[PDB]
Amino acid sequence: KPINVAIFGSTGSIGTNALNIIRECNKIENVFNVKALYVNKSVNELYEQAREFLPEYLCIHDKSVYEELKELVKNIKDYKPIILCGDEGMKEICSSNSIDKIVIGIDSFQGLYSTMYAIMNNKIVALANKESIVSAGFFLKKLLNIHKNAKIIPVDSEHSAIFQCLDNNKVLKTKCLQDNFSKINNINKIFLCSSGGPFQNLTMDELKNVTSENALKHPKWKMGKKITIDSATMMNKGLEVIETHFLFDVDYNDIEVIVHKECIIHSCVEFIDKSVISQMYYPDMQIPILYSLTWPDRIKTNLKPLDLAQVSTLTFHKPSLEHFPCIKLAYQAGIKGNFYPTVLNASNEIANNLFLNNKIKYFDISSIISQVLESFNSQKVSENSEDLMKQILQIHSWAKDKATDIYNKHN
Amino acid sequence: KPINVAIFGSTGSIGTNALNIIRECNKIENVFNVKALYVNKSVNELYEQAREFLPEYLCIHDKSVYEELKELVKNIKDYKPIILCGDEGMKEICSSNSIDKIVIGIDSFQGLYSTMYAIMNNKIVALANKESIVSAGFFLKKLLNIHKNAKIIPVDSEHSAIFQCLDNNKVLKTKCLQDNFSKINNINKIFLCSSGGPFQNLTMDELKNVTSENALKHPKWKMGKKITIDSATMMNKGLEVIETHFLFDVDYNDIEVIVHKECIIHSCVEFIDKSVISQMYYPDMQIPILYSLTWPDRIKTNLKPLDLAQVSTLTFHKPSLEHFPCIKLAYQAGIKGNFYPTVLNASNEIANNLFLNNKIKYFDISSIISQVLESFNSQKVSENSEDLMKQILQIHSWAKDKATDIYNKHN
Numbered sequence: 001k002p003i004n005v006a007i008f009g010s011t012g013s014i015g016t017n018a019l020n021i022i023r024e025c026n027k028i029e030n031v032f033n034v035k036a037l038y039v040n041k042s043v044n045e046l047y048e049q050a051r052e053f054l055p056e057y058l059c060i061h062d063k064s065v066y067e068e069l070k071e072l073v074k075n076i077k078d079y080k081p082i083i084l085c086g087d088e089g090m091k092e093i094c095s096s097n098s099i100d101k102i103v104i105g106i107d108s109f110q111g112l113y114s115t116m117y118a119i120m121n122n123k124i125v126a127l128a129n130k131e132s133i134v135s136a137g138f139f140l141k142k143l144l145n146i147h148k149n150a151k152i153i154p155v156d157s158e159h160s161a162i163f164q165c166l167d168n169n170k171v172l173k174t175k176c177l178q179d180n181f182s183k184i185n186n187i188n189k190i191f192l193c194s195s196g197g198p199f200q201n202l203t204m205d206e207l208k209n210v211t212s213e214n215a216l217k218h219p220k221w222k223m224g225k226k227i228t229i230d231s232a233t234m235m236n237k238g239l240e241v242i243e244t245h246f247l248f249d250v251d252y253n254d255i256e257v258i259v260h261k262e263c264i265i266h267s268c269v270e271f272i273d274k275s276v277i278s279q280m281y282y283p284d285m286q287i288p289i290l291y292s293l294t295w296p297d298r299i300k301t302n303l304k305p306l307d308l309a310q311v312s313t314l315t316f317h318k319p320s321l322e323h324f325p326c327i328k329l330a331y332q333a334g335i336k337g338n339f340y341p342t343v344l345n346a347s348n349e350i351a352n353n354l355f356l357n358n359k360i361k362y363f364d365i366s367s368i369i370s371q372v373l374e375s376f377n378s379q380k381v382s383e384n385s386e387d388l389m390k391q392i393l394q395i396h397s398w399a400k401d402k403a404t405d406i407y408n409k410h411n
Numbered sequence: 412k413p414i415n416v417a418i419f420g421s422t423g424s425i426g427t428n429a430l431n432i433i434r435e436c437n438k439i440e441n442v443f444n445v446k447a448l449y450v451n452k453s454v455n456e457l458y459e460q461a462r463e464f465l466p467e468y469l470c471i472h473d474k475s476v477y478e479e480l481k482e483l484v485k486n487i488k489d490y491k492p493i494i495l496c497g498d499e500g501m502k503e504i505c506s507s508n509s510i511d512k513i514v515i516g517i518d519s520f521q522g523l524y525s526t527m528y529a530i531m532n533n534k535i536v537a538l539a540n541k542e543s544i545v546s547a548g549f550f551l552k553k554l555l556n557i558h559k560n561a562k563i564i565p566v567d568s569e570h571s572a573i574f575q576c577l578d579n580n581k582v583l584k585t586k587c588l589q590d591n592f593s594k595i596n597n598i599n600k601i602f603l604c605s606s607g608g609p610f611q612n613l614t615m616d617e618l619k620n621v622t623s624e625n626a627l628k629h630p631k632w633k634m635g636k637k638i639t640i641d642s643a644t645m646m647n648k649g650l651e652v653i654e655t656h657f658l659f660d661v662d663y664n665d666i667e668v669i670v671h672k673e674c675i676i677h678s679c680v681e682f683i684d685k686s687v688i689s690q691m692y693y694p695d696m697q698i699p700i701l702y703s704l705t706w707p708d709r710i711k712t713n714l715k716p717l718d719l720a721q722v723s724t725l726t727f728h729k730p731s732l733e734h735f736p737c738i739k740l741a742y743q744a745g746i747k748g749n750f751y752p753t754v755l756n757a758s759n760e761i762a763n764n765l766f767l768n769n770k771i772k773y774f775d776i777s778s779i780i781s782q783v784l785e786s787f788n789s790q791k792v793s794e795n796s797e798d799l800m801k802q803i804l805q806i807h808s809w810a811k812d813k814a815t816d817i818y819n820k821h822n
């Protein structure tokens with residue numbers, strides 16, 4: 001009866017929000033069992049979570065703090081968790097019969113491999129790691145085809161919103177990342193809402209001068225550095241366009257980015273009859289996380305009710321692609337298909353980090369990514385699962401090195 | 412298999428919008444057969460419709476235009492329809508095996524009676540006559556418990572909006588007008604959007620002297636006189652609050668009226684997790700009517716797509732109960748329960764018509780209704796369906812007489 005959950009990335013933004021809503025839902029009844037907590041290397045933070053939630057499993061990727069973890073946990077009386085490390089620990093958790101649902105709140109390779117193991121073990125995977133979908137979308141679709149009882153449920157707020165706008169009577173007849181998903185759900189088009197980021201109202205002359213300190217400082221909503229920079233360039237939305245494509249089988253010409261600066265409407269679905277359904281709330285990750293764990297039901301929360309009269313005004317406009325060329329790059333990569341999304345994501349990782357570290361300017365971001373995309377030559381897609389995965393990782397590494405080489409030569 | 416449809420009140424607003432969307436949808440793919448048309452006495456427009464749609468059945472209320480319809484219909488080549496008359500024609504259409512869905516777009520006794528016959532024959536009934544739900548909701552609920560396979564689908568635009576926000580795998584475990592509909596659908600609260608009407612920004616002193624001409628002239632959206640006056644007083648919205656309560660079993664303290672002057676968001680549903688889902692489009696009756704005929708599926712239309720960036724701004728505010736006291740009266744009658752909603756509806760019918768005819772002032776509308784409500788005493792609710800219907804008719808008639816007497820006494 002309790003939903004048995006593992007959290008990958010339990011000290012990050014998604015992980016901490018997950019545990020916060022789980023704690024609230026478990027006050028009176030045992031709705032969820034927190035069976036496993038995994039982190040990259042935040043050993044002290046994981047220890048503190050273990051004290052509260054007492055999971056059966058604890059895992060740390062970084063083996064150099066494994067011994068520190070085991071020594072910290074000894075101080076917890078009559079608690080005997082299985083303490084694991086590295087990729088073998090990730091696989092053991094994903095394989096456990098005692099786990100039903102896995103929250104993926106970690107990025108990059110750990111996010112990809114944990115998503116893969118969860119699917120291979122026919123789990124429900126609540127995926128907040130958009131980069132895995134963008135970079136490895138065809139690989140995940142292939143895996144989902146083999147492991148027929150696995151399901152990806154989106155946690156990215158916009159994609160959660162879309163998923164919520166659908167009729168569960170039709171959702172239950174397909175699954176995310178399956179061909180024909182949009183046809184079965186009578187989807188015509190998606191409005192993909194965006195905050196627009198901190199630079200939304202700058203002129204082209206002002207935008208030329210922006211620095212990462214301008215994106216990061218005094219933010220309305222405090223988030224990780226990488227995603228803050230992607231929000232400022234709108235590459236975040238560009239990645240979310242490709243994520244939409246893959247999750248919901250929606251054609252690129254039917255995905256429309258809309259800037260909605262109040263961030264109440266989280267996204268909207270237009271059905272084939274031209275009726276539009278939208279999901280709305282305050283900016284929040286707890287509803288998306290909780291819904292991924294309860295779907296297809298909902299459960300009571302004590303979140304503050306939306307007060308629409310107090311919000312009072314909601315606005316919508318189209319983003320300028322001259323100001324936010326990263327959006328255009330993402331559409332171009334998505335439409336080209338093949339491994340261009342892998343290349344996009346990888347080259348962005350480098351450009352984003354160069355800008356974060358004050359090494360390049362705002363329009364150099366899109367210039368580097370564009371040059372790497374132009375340089376990439378299409379490859380035959382491996383039919384075999386493992387070969388395809390290796391192909392993705394090779395192309396990812398190539399794209400990163402190419403971006404770095406471009407920066408090095410114009411430096 | 413085609414969808415076989417009957418239209419009651421084919422020459423009215425609901426009726427013509429239904430024929431228009433059916434005609435347009437049919438150009439895309441043949442989904443709908445118009446099997447019966449019924450009108451009150453518009454025999455010339457009925458002839459024109461029968462030429463086009465060639466229904467098996469034609470029926471008119473008024474016997475004294477019966478012969479002329481027979482005669483007009485002779486001119487149509489190859490066409491031998493069953494031509495009927497009055498309440499008996501209505502029963503014959505509703506009991507036909509060749510009819511699956513019935514659109515009720517007529518008011519008053521004819522609306523209540525045709526709804527009743529449609530339910531008694533286990534049909535899907537697409538109901539636009541909100542006054543029958545408000546006045547005779549108890550009777551409808553009882554009938555729907557006796558005829559387990561009958562279903563009412565709402566066509567009133569805000570109620571259609573609500574119904575479209577739901578997951579049909581949950582809706583199919585219940586049906587509208589059933590106790591526990593909101594619990595099964597995990598509904599917490601409803602935002603019932605209003606246009607606010609033509610008097611929305613007037614002062615108390617301006618409202619003291621407004622006339623029916625001020626409500627009716629140069630309307631943003633042209634509708635019948637009665638509903639225009641109801642929109643002006645916001646009694647329309649109060650009736651729609653009671654409608655929401657009956658249709659969806661939502662408590663009155665969980666229904667919030669919000670003035671949304673752009674009329675794009677049609678209403679919103681807050682679930683128990685606090686996630687809010689809304690339906691949006693241009694102001695429109697075609698999507699509500701169409702959804703009632705396709706539910707639980709959707710079909711393709713060639714309606715104009717909503718352009719959110721062009722709409723640009725949506726606004727929301729609370730209505731002033733001091734300016735729109737009819738809203739308060741509707742809540743009070745709803746909360747009191749019993750037959751108070753029947754009394755509200757009947758007395759408003761009189762008060763609306765008095766104001767329309769320049770016999771009373773704006774604040775007299777609420778004053779008359781208030782005084783009628785105050786004079787009513789709660790009645791033992793008959794357990795028997797036939798007695799319950801007679802109680803509703805007698806209370807309706809009493810309430811109209813009472814409103815009339817209050818007018819004549821002060822006058």
Ligand SMILES: O=C(CC[C@@H](c1ccccc1)P(=O)(O)O)N(O)CCc1ccccc1
Nearest residue numbers: 157194195196197221231236237283284285
């Ligand atoms: O993709 C994102 C972050 C970037 C987008 C965003 C930024 C700011 C507000 C909302 C959305 P942007 O549209 O700028 O790319 N989210 O899904 C997280 C949304 C969220 C949730 C709780 C609190 C704050 C933010």
Ligand SMILES: O=C(CC[C@@H](c1ccccc1)P(=O)(O)O)N(O)CCc1ccccc1
Nearest residue numbers: 568605606607608632642647648694695696
């Ligand atoms: O209840 C109503 C009419 C009164 C409400 C209304 C008035 C004006 C715009 C929208 C709604 P009000 O909120 O003033 O009571 N509808 O369901 C009709 C909606 C509609 C459809 C197509 C074209 C115009 C209007």
Ligand SMILES: [Ca+2]
Nearest residue numbers: 064065067068
């Ligand atoms: Ca160490």
Ligand SMILES: [Ca+2]
Nearest residue numbers: 164165166167
């Ligand atoms: Ca839904």
Ligand SMILES: [Ca+2]
Nearest residue numbers: 188251253254
């Ligand atoms: Ca299309």
Ligand SMILES: [Mn+2]
Nearest residue numbers: 156157158240
């Ligand atoms: Mn997002």
Ligand SMILES: [Mn+2]
Nearest residue numbers: 567568569651
């Ligand atoms: Mn309405």
